[PDB]
Amino acid sequence: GSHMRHRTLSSSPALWASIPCPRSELRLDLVLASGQSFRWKEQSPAHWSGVLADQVWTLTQTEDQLYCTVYRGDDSQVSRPTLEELETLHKYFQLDVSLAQLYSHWASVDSHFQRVAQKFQGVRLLRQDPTECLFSFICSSNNNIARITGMVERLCQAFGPRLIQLDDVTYHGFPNLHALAGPEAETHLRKLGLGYRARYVRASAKAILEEQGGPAWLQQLRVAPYEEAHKALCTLPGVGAKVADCICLMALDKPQAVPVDVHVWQIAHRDYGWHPKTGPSPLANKELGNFFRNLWGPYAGWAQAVLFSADL
Amino acid sequence: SHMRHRTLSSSPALWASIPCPRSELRLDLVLASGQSFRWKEQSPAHWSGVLADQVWTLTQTEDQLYCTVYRVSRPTLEELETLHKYFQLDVSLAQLYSHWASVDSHFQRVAQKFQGVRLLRQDPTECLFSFICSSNNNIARITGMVERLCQAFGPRLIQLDDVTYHGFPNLHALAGPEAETHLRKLGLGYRARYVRASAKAILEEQGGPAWLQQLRVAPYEEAHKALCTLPGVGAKVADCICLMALDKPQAVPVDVHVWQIAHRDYGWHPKTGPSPLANKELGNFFRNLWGPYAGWAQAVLFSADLR
Amino acid sequence: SHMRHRTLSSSPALWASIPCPRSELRLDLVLASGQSFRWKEQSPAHWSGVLADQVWTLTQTEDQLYCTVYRDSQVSRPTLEELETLHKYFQLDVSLAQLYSHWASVDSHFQRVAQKFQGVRLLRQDPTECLFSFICSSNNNIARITGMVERLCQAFGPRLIQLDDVTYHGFPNLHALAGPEAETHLRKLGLGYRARYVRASAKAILEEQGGPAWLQQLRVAPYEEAHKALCTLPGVGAKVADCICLMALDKPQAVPVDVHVWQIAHRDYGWHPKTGPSPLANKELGNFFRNLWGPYAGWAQAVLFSADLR
Numbered sequence: 001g002s003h004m005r006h007r008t009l010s011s012s013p014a015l016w017a018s019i020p021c022p023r024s025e026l027r028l029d030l031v032l033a034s035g036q037s038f039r040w041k042e043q044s045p046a047h048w049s050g051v052l053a054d055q056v057w058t059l060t061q062t063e064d065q066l067y068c069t070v071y072r073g074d075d076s077q078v079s080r081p082t083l084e085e086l087e088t089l090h091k092y093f094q095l096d097v098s099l100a101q102l103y104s105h106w107a108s109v110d111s112h113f114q115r116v117a118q119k120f121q122g123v124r125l126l127r128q129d130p131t132e133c134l135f136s137f138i139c140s141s142n143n144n145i146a147r148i149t150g151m152v153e154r155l156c157q158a159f160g161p162r163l164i165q166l167d168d169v170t171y172h173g174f175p176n177l178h179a180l181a182g183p184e185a186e187t188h189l190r191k192l193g194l195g196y197r198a199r200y201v202r203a204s205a206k207a208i209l210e211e212q213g214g215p216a217w218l219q220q221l222r223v224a225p226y227e228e229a230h231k232a233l234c235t236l237p238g239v240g241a242k243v244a245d246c247i248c249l250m251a252l253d254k255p256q257a258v259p260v261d262v263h264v265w266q267i268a269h270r271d272y273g274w275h276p277k278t279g280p281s282p283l284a285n286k287e288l289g290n291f292f293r294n295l296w297g298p299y300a301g302w303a304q305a306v307l308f309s310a311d312l
Numbered sequence: 313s314h315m316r317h318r319t320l321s322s323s324p325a326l327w328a329s330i331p332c333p334r335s336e337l338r339l340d341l342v343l344a345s346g347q348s349f350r351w352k353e354q355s356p357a358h359w360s361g362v363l364a365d366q367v368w369t370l371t372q373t374e375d376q377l378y379c380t381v382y383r384v385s386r387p388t389l390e391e392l393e394t395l396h397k398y399f400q401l402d403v404s405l406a407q408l409y410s411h412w413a414s415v416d417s418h419f420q421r422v423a424q425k426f427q428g429v430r431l432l433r434q435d436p437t438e439c440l441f442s443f444i445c446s447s448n449n450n451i452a453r454i455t456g457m458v459e460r461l462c463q464a465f466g467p468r469l470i471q472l473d474d475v476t477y478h479g480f481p482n483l484h485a486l487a488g489p490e491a492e493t494h495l496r497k498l499g500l501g502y503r504a505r506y507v508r509a510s511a512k513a514i515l516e517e518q519g520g521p522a523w524l525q526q527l528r529v530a531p532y533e534e535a536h537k538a539l540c541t542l543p544g545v546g547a548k549v550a551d552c553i554c555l556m557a558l559d560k561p562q563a564v565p566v567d568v569h570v571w572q573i574a575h576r577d578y579g580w581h582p583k584t585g586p587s588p589l590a591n592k593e594l595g596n597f598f599r600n601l602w603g604p605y606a607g608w609a610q611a612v613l614f615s616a617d618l619r
Numbered sequence: 620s621h622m623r624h625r626t627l628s629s630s631p632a633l634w635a636s637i638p639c640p641r642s643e644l645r646l647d648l649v650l651a652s653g654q655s656f657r658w659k660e661q662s663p664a665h666w667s668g669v670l671a672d673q674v675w676t677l678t679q680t681e682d683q684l685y686c687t688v689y690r691d692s693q694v695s696r697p698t699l700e701e702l703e704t705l706h707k708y709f710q711l712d713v714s715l716a717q718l719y720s721h722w723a724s725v726d727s728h729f730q731r732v733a734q735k736f737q738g739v740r741l742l743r744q745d746p747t748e749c750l751f752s753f754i755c756s757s758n759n760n761i762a763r764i765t766g767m768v769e770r771l772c773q774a775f776g777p778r779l780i781q782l783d784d785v786t787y788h789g790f791p792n793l794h795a796l797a798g799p800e801a802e803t804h805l806r807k808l809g810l811g812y813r814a815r816y817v818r819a820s821a822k823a824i825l826e827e828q829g830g831p832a833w834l835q836q837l838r839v840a841p842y843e844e845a846h847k848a849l850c851t852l853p854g855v856g857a858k859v860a861d862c863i864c865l866m867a868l869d870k871p872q873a874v875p876v877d878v879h880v881w882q883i884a885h886r887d888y889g890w891h892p893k894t895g896p897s898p899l900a901n902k903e904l905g906n907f908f909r910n911l912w913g914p915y916a917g918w919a920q921a922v923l924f925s926a927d928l929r
């Protein structure tokens with residue numbers, strides 16, 4: 001292992017900065033391991049360590065403050081987070097968005113939400129890098145949080161740049177398309193236990209580079225309307241309506257995207273008495289997405305995240 | 313002299329008791345569960361509110377219902393009897409709970425923690441205009457509208473602490489030319505017109521209160537149809553009044569809340585989303601399951617769902 | 620009686636052990652979850668009841684199943700053959716850890732519920748006892764059936780032993796339940812209409828089917844043949860026949876369906892018939908759970924029942 005160690009607050013308070021953030025606007029423990037991102041681990045209690053854009057971070061919070069420290073993978077000396085680095089963290093947690101106001105609105109139109117959301121405040125959507133989000137959720141088919149976390153970790157060690165080692169944890173940045181598109185990529189990824197998903201990863205990387213003109217295409221979908229972005233993602237190998245809706249909600253700034261599968265069907269039927277007006281089909285899935293947009297409004301995906309967090 | 317809300321230890325000379333197990337009646341489940349909007353717990357375990365132009369305070373032990381009335385004398389026999397009628401204590405809740413539990417496994421699991429849920433026997437006039445006055449969302453907003461309505465149009469009875477108690481208005485007061493303008497200011501919106509119109513309609517039809525009293529004796533089906541001819545009264549409101557004021561224990565008021573319970577807890581779908589015909593079907597389902605006190609069994613499930 | 624219910628600290632000379640993880644068997648989830656109606660927790664963590672005309676007390680640690688047997692005879696610790704009949708009764712040859720894994724892999728709902736409810740397995744019951752027990756199961760709950768079976772056994776079954784104020788009787792044979800008095804007697808013991816089905820089914824197995832060797836033939840016969848054969852008996856429909864199949868005739872795929880399974884299926888799985896409870900829709904719901912969980916569907920059901928009853 002490495003002589004360099006995971007930081008805690010009160011081990012090294014010189015190296016931590018703070019963002020003013022109520023625990024009611026963000027609970028790290030509900031957002032960082034609830035199946036949005038698969039790159040955060042609680043390495044010591046209340047201290048969440050993980051990768052953002054080829055930098056490792058540790059995060060912890062009091063009732064009113066979000067405390068962050070950053071580790072850089074170069075000669076540069078151990079330093080407290082910069083202003084620009086704090087701003088990318090403010091963007092990542094979309095803290096511009098008032099969760100208090102959204103919770104109020106959903107509770108006003110949905111009695112079920114009002115009962116369940118009391119114990120589950122500070123559930124918001126991370127704003128993820130599209131590349132990371134796409135290839136993460138391509139590995140999401142027929143999977144659970146624990147197994148995906150493993151696949152993504154091994155995928156990053158194999159294809160992503162080595163950043164730094166803290167204790168016995170070696171941190172890698174998320175691979176670029178070129179690394180995942182290479183001739184060995186599928187064989188290698190299959191060894192790492194991706195199974196059939198290994199093909200979709202290589203094929204989607206090749207497709208975006210050759211057919212769509214690189215990662216600037218995923219950035220175009222961030223600006224494009226929800227419907228255009230969703231259809232465009234669904235043309236990729238391994239990406240159907242569910243995965244396209246996850247990416248839309250979590251990386252392409254489409255707060256109205258409602259990823260539908262057996263889990264959402266179960267909630268809808270049990271808690272709302274919903275049946276299709278036309279069992280899961282492509283058309284009924286779209287109908288159930290529309291139902292939740294009609295009920296909750298243009299941040300329907302965000303309301304869904306609160307119900308998922310409350311069901312788990 | 314400044315008069316205060318009584319407690320049982322403070323002035324026990326002025327309290328009478330009715331023998332009543334806490335299993336036959338829990339005041340805390342019945343008096344602020346959206347049947348009546350005129351009871352507040354002004355001090356702990358002590359419920360104060362208006363019955364027929366008199367203020368009462370109510371509290372209970374495990375075996376006794378303690379009541380005091382403000383008109384300095386203890387409640388009379390006739391006054392105790394109107395309170396016995398109000399809580400319909402002739403009806404054995406122990407026997408009903410037994411019967412429902414015997415035919416309904418779900419009820420048996422849920423009703424354990426929620427004993428003493430019964431239906432108040434409300435004045436028809438107060439019940440009708442209370443439930444017309446509701447957007448039918450929340451207890452708090454209706455409680456406000458009814459309180460302000462009573463201060464504006466009802467006779468002043470007494471003041472206890474900083475609470476001024478008014479009796480419910482008579483039909484004449486709600487039927488007047490000013491009634492709609494006034495009620496609109498009190499925030500009723502378009503419902504203010506249905507209140508005035510329904511008051512006029514009931515007065516026009518024989519004796520005002522005497523018509524609603526006829527519906528109390530009339531069969532459930534006749535009473536329900538008759539209420540539905542009133543401005544602002546549909547099947548749901550007519551079923552509330554039937555169950556709560558017209559002695560129709562089989563009345564099952566149906567809306568999205570009952571649909572949710574029925575579907576989730578009983579696996580019920582219509583055999584023909586909410587429609588008038590499907591709502592009637594769901595009412596029939598619960599009468600078939602629970603029997604002639606279906607409305608009372610419903611009240612237990614509502615009390616157990618809200619907690 | 621001068622003879623008392625044993626506890627593990629009171630008389631450890633008379634107890635033997637079977638190596639058995641609490642993850643493979645929780646007595647407290649299996650012995651009063653409506654499979655058998657003959658086990659009571661007479662002292663905490665100590666389950667006393669009848670197996671094959673012998674009384675047992677059972678208790679467990681995290682890794683061991685501790686058993687003592689009461690036989691007049693010299694007070695002795697359980698024999699090897701007696702331990703083996705207990706190993707058969709709990710079907711401990713079957714890996715519950717492997718089955719739980721398989722069900723959890725194909726069913727997210729099961730995975731959430733089965734965490735707190737491990738060691739739910741199916742007892743292997745005597746067919747006669749299971750048949751007449753579950754004939755009394757129509758329009759009934761665990762508490763009321765436990766009473767009917769207890770009174771039935773005292774009235775018609777041989778006295779085995781008394782421990783404290785509890786007199787233990789073996790289950791009656793068919794001949795005892797088939798007599799001219801049987802229905803009148805059983806009606807007094809509070810069985811109601813079920814008293815008729817008990818006498819009639821006893822008569823039917825003796826006269827029409829050639830005695831209890833018929834129930835042993837159904838244990839060897841395929842599920843579907845055994846089920847149809849049970850359904851020819853008075854008071855045995857699809858639900859009771861499926862209970863007997865699962866709990867006594869070694870048919871792990873049998874899924875007893877009634878209003879209780881309908882409720883779980885609809886609420887927890889969003890299932891509707893691809894067509895309210897009917898004979899055909901009940902069969903459809905049984906097929907749904909066999910399709911989902913595989914050939915041990917009945918065992919997976921038992922886990923959900925144990926988790927629903929809490």
Ligand SMILES: Ic1ccc(Nc2nc(C3CC3)nc3ccccc23)cc1
Pocket residue numbers: 034035036140141143144145148242246249259260261263264301302304305308
């Ligand atoms: I709002 C929200 C929050 C979290 C996630 N998480 C995941 N959603 C799904 C299905 C339900 C779409 N499947 C997954 C499988 C494995 C891991 C994470 C998953 C999706 C949407």
Ligand SMILES: Ic1ccc(Nc2nc(C3CC3)nc3ccccc23)cc1
Pocket residue numbers: 652653654756757759760761764858862865875876877879880917918920921922924
């Ligand atoms: I796997 C399994 C586990 C326990 C039981 N128990 C019982 N199942 C039923 C209906 C639901 C089939 N009804 C009963 C009535 C009374 C007592 C016990 C009963 C059945 C199957």
Ligand code: NI
Pocket residue numbers: 269275575581885891
């Ligand atoms: Ni349904």
